[model samples]
Target: AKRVVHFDYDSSDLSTEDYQTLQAHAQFLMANANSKVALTGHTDERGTREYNMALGERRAKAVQNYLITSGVNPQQLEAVSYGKEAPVNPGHDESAWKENRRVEINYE
Candidate 1:
């Protein structure tokens, strides 16, 4: 399954709805000790690589911190930034890129 936490354009803010969803996910993660999560940050094609990379990392950690406080082991989670290497949409419009700005959560 592709578990993604989306972000607004030019922001790493964790919205209320998204936070609530992750809180639910955190319940299962804490229940399953064997679970490991890899948070990969991505960005829309709007910014330069440098800015995107840092922003990406910020996005990744945004989820990471939430999960950490929710009781998941730190060892079971890792945060990495893919920047803009991979995108959900190739279209050159902000509307199209709306879903592109996100962090992909992989279970390992």
Candidate 2:
């Protein structure tokens, strides 16, 4: 199943729930050896473009590491950073910002 996991403001650490989600995804990937997942990381528009880009990458890598430890093959996972370029919620508020800082899991 595809899932979008969010992160705290200015943070790349995964929470318990995030681990659970990644675990589930790992199971799915293990069951389907041909499957591949792309983790597209994003960030809120609270910092410079360059900084947000790196932060977004960090967020993606964090998830990638978790999935690796969960038994997902590195070859089956790809990480990309959109930084603050994409916002799930267009509104400029805490709720929207929170929604924007996320990693979208796409299985293909």
Candidate 3:
């Protein structure tokens, strides 16, 4: 499964709208102990590098907390922040950056 839960530009809070999407992933992980996931947080290019990195970290932690609460073993996951260094699109515009605020759940 590909998980890319996005957040608001300045918000690291996960939306209720994404719960079901992530719920599926939570169960999938629980089903396989060997499955490892990396929670990589990313942001748009509208803030200072440090602030953006911090926010990105929070975003990843938010997802990490959710997974922990769902009974996934903490050792199966790792979190990292990309500090707005990666974007879903190359266009330097609102439409593009909005899609960049994401926490990518990667199978490692």
Candidate 4:
């Protein structure tokens, strides 16, 4: 039941849909106490590398905070920032950049 939380460009604010999605993930986390997750944060390449890194951290932290508030055990979850190191789609356009900025939620 793990899920990847999405973010807006140059923004870390979670939208209404984000909250709903996080809520669902929270339920799954609550039901599986032994589960652990890696919250990988990412960003588009539109900004400077450093800026993207900071944004990535903010994005990850935002999601981590939500999970914690939703009752996830901090010890069982980790937040990571990939910055703009990898891109699912590489292009100098809006669509590619948007698709590149994302978080990958992994369970172990």
TM-score winner: 2
Instruction: Supply the global lDDT for candidate 1.
Output: 0.87
Model 1 segments more than 4 A misplaced:
none
- Across 1-108, the per-residue lDDT of candidate 4 in tens digits comes to 337667777898888888888888778888989988888889988878899898898888898899899888898789989899988888888888877777777888
Using all chains and alpha carbons, the TM-scores for the candidates as numbered come to 0.93, 0.96, 0.94, 0.91
Model 1: lDDT of residue 46: 83
Give the Cα lDDT of each candidate: 0.87, 0.92, 0.89, 0.83
Residues forming the 10-long window of minimal summed lDDT in candidate 4: 1-10
Alpha-carbon runs more than 4 Å astray in model 4: none
Q: Tens digit of lDDT per residue, candidate 1, span 1-92?
A: 23887899888988887788778768878888898888999999887999999989999999999989988788889999989878889889
Q: Indicate the residue-level lDDT of 82 in model 4.
A: 86
lDDT of 3 by residue, 1-108 (tens): 558898986998888877777788889889999999999999999889999999999999999999989899998999999988887787789889988999999999
Error of 2 at 99 (Å): 0.4
Rate residue 80 of model 2 by lDDT. Answer: 98
Report the error of model 3 at residue 27, Å. Answer: 0.2
lDDT order of candidates, best first? 2, 3, 1, 4
**Can you give the lDDT of residue 59 in candidate 4?**
89
Most lDDT-accurate candidate? 2
RMSD over all Cα atoms, model 2: 1.0
Winner by TM-score between candidate 3 and candidate 1: 3
Clashing residue pairs in candidate 2 are: none
Higher-scoring candidate on lDDT, 1 or 2: 2
lDDT of 4: 0.83
